[PDB]
Design a protein around this ligand. Sequence first.
Ligand SMILES: O=C(O)C[C@@H]1CN(c2ncnc3[nH]c4ccccc4c23)CCO1
Length: 167
Amino acid sequence: VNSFSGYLKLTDNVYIKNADIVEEAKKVKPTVVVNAANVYLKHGGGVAGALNKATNNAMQVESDDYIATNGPLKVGGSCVLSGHNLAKHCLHVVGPNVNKGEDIQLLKSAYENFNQHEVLLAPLLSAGIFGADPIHSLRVCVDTVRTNVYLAVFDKNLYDKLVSSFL
Ligand SMILES: O=C(O)C[C@@H]1CN(c2ncnc3[nH]c4ccccc4c23)CCO1
C-alpha cells in the first residue's frame, strides 16, 4: 500500500492522474520524482522549470555543480540528485526533444531508467515542450516500465484523451 490517491489504474504497474506534478510531489513526498530534464540540466521551462521553481532554484544550483563535475547527460540517460522539498530523490531523465530533431526511438531508453526504482511519480517523457505525441509516450511507458509508476498529466483535456484512447 502507498500514499498515491485518485489515480486511474491502466495496467498492473502503471497509474495515471490529472494533476500538477509539483503539487502532487509536495503532498505525497514520494521517494522518487522524475524530472523531464535536458542534457545540460538547465531547468528553464516545462516540467523542469516548474519543479526547479518549487525548490527556490536549489535544484538548478545542485544541477550546475553536477554538470561542472560530470559533463552533460546522454539523450535517453539519467542521473539521481536530491529531491529537495519535493521528494527524497529526483531522477532527472532526458527524453528525446523532437524540437531538436532527436531520435524518438530513444524514448524507450529514457523510460528504462525508471526500472531502477521500485516506485516513481513521473510526467510523460518527451511530452509537452519536448514535442512528442503524449499518446505514444504513454504507450512506450506501459510497454517499457515494469516498476510502479504514477503518471501526473497537467492538462485535463490531454488526460481525458490519454484515458479514452488507451488500449
Ligand atoms: O502532461 C501534459 O499534458 C504536459 C507534459 C508534461 N508536463 C507536466 N506534467 C506534469 N505536471 C506538470 N506541471 C507543470 C508545470 C509547468 C509546466 C509543465 C508542467 C507539467 C509539461 C510538459 O508536457
